[model samples]
Target: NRVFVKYPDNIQDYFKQSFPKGYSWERSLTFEDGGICNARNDITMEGDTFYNKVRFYGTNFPANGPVMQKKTLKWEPSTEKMYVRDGVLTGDIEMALLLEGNAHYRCDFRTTYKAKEKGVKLPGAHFVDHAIEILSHDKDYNKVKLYEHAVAHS
Candidate 1:
């Protein structure tokens, strides 16, 4: 059996008030094929939900910050699942950014990792980017897969 994390319906308020002001969550990941991508999401509360202003800066080589992209959209807690493993809480969380008619940038989290060498200290919550994905949709409502493997910062 699986159980989702208990979150309030107005999770946007929780997001806005829980963190420090002017706080931004960022991540960077290096692909096995030598490419790398860096992403950051700035959260702001508006109307009835939270707006995730996302920016992606990356390249196909061993570098980043040269190719940049931006997106701003509202998101809500769509689904989550959790369980206890060896007495530690672990699970995955996914939010519904855009219900339909567009490609959504999903930034999520889990409580475990397989990164053996965890020496480098990140700015904020330090965790290995694992099985991350970049995807898109065509005019036909079909799906496309882009870069995946993933980082995070304050």
Candidate 2:
């Protein structure tokens, strides 16, 4: 079966602009106690498959508050699929689906923090206030262009 996926070219461009050249440290932070903090980020694009992963450390935000940093996002494009991992410090991680000639899908990846008492940092908390726009070249790609955006709550 032939399925068409609809994703914004600009969204792809946004990913490229955000994390260019195979992913590196998008940003870093240092604590007052001299505790070093950083994020390990990378993006892989093969055929039409897109995979992105960002591991963070050091900073911690309130579970019910807004995030203070920009989390790194990794995008991978494969022949028939596109995957997205939004960097959030809490709640469920979102896995966006992009399939050719079909409706878009979003899979939630739940996370477990080690420090439940003090509240560990959310996995991808950095991208809480950012916007992700998806556009389509043709209507037949998916008929309707999917638009997904997120915001942090306090």
Candidate 3:
């Protein structure tokens, strides 16, 4: 058995000593209408209790440099028995899961594609910007994208 040199004094100390190498885990919540709610943080998966917790962001928040005014958001299982399907209206502008089943219910999402494309008619359910990537966790850097499919960037 191994013993700590100083027996971590508190809960905070114990966490650091036990997990010297802290980590972050992220997952995406995709929408039927080609959008994404990218969630992340140091706690990664647990302790956050996101499963039962109401995880909302950006709607009222600003989307400026470092921060800015967000568009809007609301959450409710849009459809019960919602099909666990893919081809979520991607670049092809086509046609969405959670595990643990029934992505029909989620705590992190629910929405409207807040595109700024003016005069341009938005697709029934679409993001004129970069299409949503379903398999969100890419070992290859999910490259820092710059630019927007401005509807009317006025």
| Models sorted by TM-score, best on top | 1, 2, 3
Q: Model 1 misses residue 55 by how many Å?
A: 1.1
Question: How do the predictions measure up, each by TM-score?
Answer: 0.33, 0.24, 0.20
How are the candidates ranked when ordered by lDDT, highest leading?
Answer: 1, 2, 3
Error of 3 at 118 (Å): 47
Q: Give the per-residue lDDT digits (tens) of candidate 2, residues 113-141.
A: 12212322222222222234445535433
Residue-pair clashes per candidate, as listed?
A: 2, 26, 14
lDDT of 1 by residue, 7-126 (tens): 334221222233333234445555343445676666554565555678887577523321122232344434334333453333455433432437554445343211112332212222
Under the 3 Å rule for N, CA and C atoms, how many clashes does model 1 have?
A: 2
Best TM-score among the predictions, by candidate number:
1
lDDT of 3 at 43: 32
Q: Model 3 Cα displacement at 134 (Å)?
A: 26
What range of 10 consecutive residues in model 1 has the weakest lDDT sum?
A: 113-122
